[PDB]
Design a protein around this ligand. Sequence first.
Ligand code: MG
Ligand code: MG
Ligand code: MG
Ligand code: MG
Ligand code: MG
Ligand code: MG
Ligand code: MG
Ligand code: MG
Ligand code: MG
Ligand code: MG
Lengths: 99, 74, 140, 229, 180
Amino acid sequence: ENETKRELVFKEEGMEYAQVIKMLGNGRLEVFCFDGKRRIGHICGRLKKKVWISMDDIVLVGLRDFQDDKCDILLKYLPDEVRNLKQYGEIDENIKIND
Amino acid sequence: MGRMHGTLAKAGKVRKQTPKVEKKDKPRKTPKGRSYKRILYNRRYAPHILATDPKKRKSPNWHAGKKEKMDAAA
Amino acid sequence: GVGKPRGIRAGRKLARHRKDQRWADNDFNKRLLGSRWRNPFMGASHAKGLVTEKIGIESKQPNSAVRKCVRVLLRKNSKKIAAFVPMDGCLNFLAENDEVLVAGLGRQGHAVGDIPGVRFKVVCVKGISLLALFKGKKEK
Amino acid sequence: KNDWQPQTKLGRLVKYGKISSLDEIFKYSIPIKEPEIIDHFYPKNKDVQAEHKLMEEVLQITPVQKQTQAGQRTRFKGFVVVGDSNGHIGLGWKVAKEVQGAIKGAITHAKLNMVPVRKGYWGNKIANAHTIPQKITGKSGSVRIRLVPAPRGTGIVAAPIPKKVLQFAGVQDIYTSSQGCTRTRGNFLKATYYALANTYRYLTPDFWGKPEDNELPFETFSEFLHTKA
Amino acid sequence: GKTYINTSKTYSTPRRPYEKERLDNEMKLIGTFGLKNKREVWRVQMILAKFRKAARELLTLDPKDPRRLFEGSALLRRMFKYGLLSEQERKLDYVLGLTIHKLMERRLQTRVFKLNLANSIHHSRVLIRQRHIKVGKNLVNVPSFMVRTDSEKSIDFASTSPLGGGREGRTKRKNAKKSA
RNA sequence: GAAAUGAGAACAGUGUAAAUCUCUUAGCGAGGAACAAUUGGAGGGCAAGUCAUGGUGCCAGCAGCCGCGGUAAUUCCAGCUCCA
Ligand SMILES: [Mg+2]
Ligand SMILES: [Mg+2]
Ligand SMILES: [Mg+2]
Ligand SMILES: [Mg+2]
Ligand SMILES: [Mg+2]
Ligand SMILES: [Mg+2]
Ligand SMILES: [Mg+2]
Ligand SMILES: [Mg+2]
Ligand SMILES: [Mg+2]
Ligand SMILES: [Mg+2]
């Protein structure tokens, strides 16, 4: 089971990798960023439609210049995209991915 | 929904992206003043237009493009 | 019947009765007690302020976008105000701590459209217009 | 089958060129059900200068919904005004599942609904009755319209809709007042129409004397009708 | 600065900014009387309106009333001199019936053109702005001049300009003064 | 195709306590991005697109209100056109 293979997308400049910490509501969440900062993310109008996100998922996060404290949830990684990220050496090898 | 390139929420995004297209250089010019309202009266409220079926009267902007000005003149 | 006196000596009761019931009309109420003067503009048309923060504001349902905004410190009031920044990438024309000119959004004290609760817009930056700047007539 | 075969006694009386004028029908208060009788008095030979040119206008077209056996079934309503600018006006409306259908049926309806507006004088009585004899009132649903007579050349002071009706009636000069929910276009139209109709209902002082006593067309023309065609 | 000169407003703006029937009528007016600029028709409307308020107030009044007699007389005398009213209608009621179509027809443009002095309702409006026409003892450079029935006699070209026997203008001069 | 003329600019004359401007007037001053009007709008309210227009793809943004934008946008950014 999976949605069609598409290229694992990396953190471009202005984005950061993140892991979901707790659930807020209104389509919001607290994320731990591999920037090293906690932020409060909002979920994309795109993602609100397609991909349901939950706790401890690994997500890509589009950042904001002005408010660093808020960030936008961009895309969710499939656990395989994640293990691949670890392979590539983008995100640290000690991280908990749950199924 | 796997197509993403730019950061979401960047400030000038759509305006910056838009190609710069230059305004066409006009042969001659648009008459200012009374003469303009003359022009309008002509192409709109003039006798020949009135003579035609008021329910079949053709709406002022119907043509964007010139191919239908060619179809209008024929 | 009609619950209302008709009589020629009834004049004052009539007029007093109105001088009372008139208070239920809102614009009258808000007018009559100073309400205007206490608002962040102090009755005024526009105001100048300083920019504390550039802030994004997530739009009301059912719309999603990030409304570019600023929190301004009004120079007359020293009250803090949350104001919207119009058109496209105009949030860029703003630097933190500039002089900024701010007006109502057209609902006279209330928020418009999808931006929740935000009652003000940005008009001028330093000395110049956001319009002047947008269309690129002048430079900051 | 472009030839009209009358199904009404009145229809026969009209087609065969017997009842003189339209207003006469109105006078003897003969019900018009046949939307032919009306096209009769308004000839389609098309001479552009007559003020007796009969006019039709679609006013409303509404997508009406129904919830039926798990489906949502749409039809169209339409409102139509018919009038010669000289004294005569009608209003009609029809529901059908095809638009041009609603329109045709509503035109027909409006014709069946023809009514004689009365035209009065504001001030000194000189030439063309430019307005109504009295102030009167249309009532439809919540809505109310009051028509008050205006001096010469005041023109029609009234909302887009009742204005359109009034122009069709040929009231040149008038003052309007409206109560109720006026955005309900059918009620607004209806009101204006009924109002315009009440002009002849009002007994003004000039109507006070003994009227003429005539025999109904049907009694006079009885011989004609009982021939077998 | 204290100053006692009086305030004016020549026109008025419609309750309803966009309505087809009205806009169309206004453009038929602008078309036929060769105006520019809707407010011209609006100020004509204003003028007519003034006339009508007058007639109305006077019709409030008793027919015997001194005021209606004098001021009514004055209003109609005022019509003739402008030829807004025909000989036969001297009754106040006919004032109300005044058309903007009649009143615009009293324009100096409308007059010059219809006098075969100009080829076009437009030709006119330049001409009387070109300083090419005299009315009465003056030279009228204004299109909006309402025409005295009496001065309709003397409308001819300026003795100043060509068409008046005056020197041919700078154009003909500069063309002709360059030989071969 | 030549006529017409003011904006401009000037001798003079008018005007002023003087100066300026007006007004009257010689010598001058019109064929094209010049002597070239804008400011707001084309979904409804509300006049004006039935662009097989390009960009963006719920982003940037629009929207007084209803709403438009999630890949064929009548609503954003633009070009053309059209309206007030
Ligand atoms: Mg109120
Ligand atoms: Mg407002
Ligand atoms: Mg809402
Ligand atoms: Mg521009
Ligand atoms: Mg009302
Ligand atoms: Mg001098
Ligand atoms: Mg030129
Ligand atoms: Mg716009
Ligand atoms: Mg497109
Ligand atoms: Mg556009």
